[PDB]
């Protein structure tokens, strides 16, 4: 499969999440995603074909993971934007007030601004600390997807937020949305990963 930020993948033929970013670990290919999407060794599939397994994860506390892929996968430095693509150029962290977009299988590509950093989410499973908050809308299924600036600087992966009864926060005003992402920097250093760029 071609690995691009924002596309759907399923875990153990049950749950769905979105791909965050293609990365490598020495000769190993992989993608970063949300830790809540799977447990170590869970199997990831893309379009019904097995692509790899969860190699590590932390959730709750943090919300991060990486899936190591088979050699046959094609890593690309891109994030889906409709039928088009945003090129990944690096991981400079943007500051509060910067515009940012996110990509995932349920709401597609959405943009907004970063409104706060170091936010705690109280999920049923336990607290997740140190998340950054944006006001781009998102929905059930978008987890693990990419957060990126139009300039191509990767910010983190989709964690959670105030989903309404219709499964997203897209029908409430930007001012009332809390969409939270796990910072990419600590994920790359924690696992020794390098981002694929173009």
């Amino acid at each position: 499969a071609n690995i691009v930020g924002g596309i759907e993948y399923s875990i153990n033929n049950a749950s769905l999440c979105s791909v965050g970013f293609s990365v490598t670990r020495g000769a190993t290919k992989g993608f970063v995603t949300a830790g809540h999407c799977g447990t170590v060794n869970a199997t990831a599939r893309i379009g019904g074909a097995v692509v790899g397994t969860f190699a590590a994860r932390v959730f709750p506390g943090n919300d991060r993971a990486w899936v190591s892929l088979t050699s046959a996968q094609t890593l690309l430095p891109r994030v889906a934007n409709g039928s088009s693509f945003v090129t990944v150029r690096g991981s400079t962290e943007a500051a509060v007030g910067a515009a940012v977009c996110r990509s995932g299988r349920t709401t597609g590509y959405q943009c907004g601004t970063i409104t706060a950093k170091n936010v705690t989410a109280n999920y049923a499973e336990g607290a997740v600390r140190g998340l950054t908050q944006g006001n781009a809308c998102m929905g059930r299924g978008d987890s693990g997807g990419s957060w990126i600036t139009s300039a191509g600087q990767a910010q983190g992966v989709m964690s959670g937020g105030n989903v309404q009864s219709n499964g997203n926060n897209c029908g409430i005003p930007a001012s009332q949305r809390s969409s939270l992402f796990e910072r990419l920097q600590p994920i790359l250093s924690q696992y020794g990963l390098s981002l694929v760029t173009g």
Binding site: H36, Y123, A124, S143, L180
Partner: peptide, 4 residues
């Protein structure tokens, strides 16, 4: 808040 909920994960996703």
């Amino acid at each position: 808040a909920a994960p996703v």
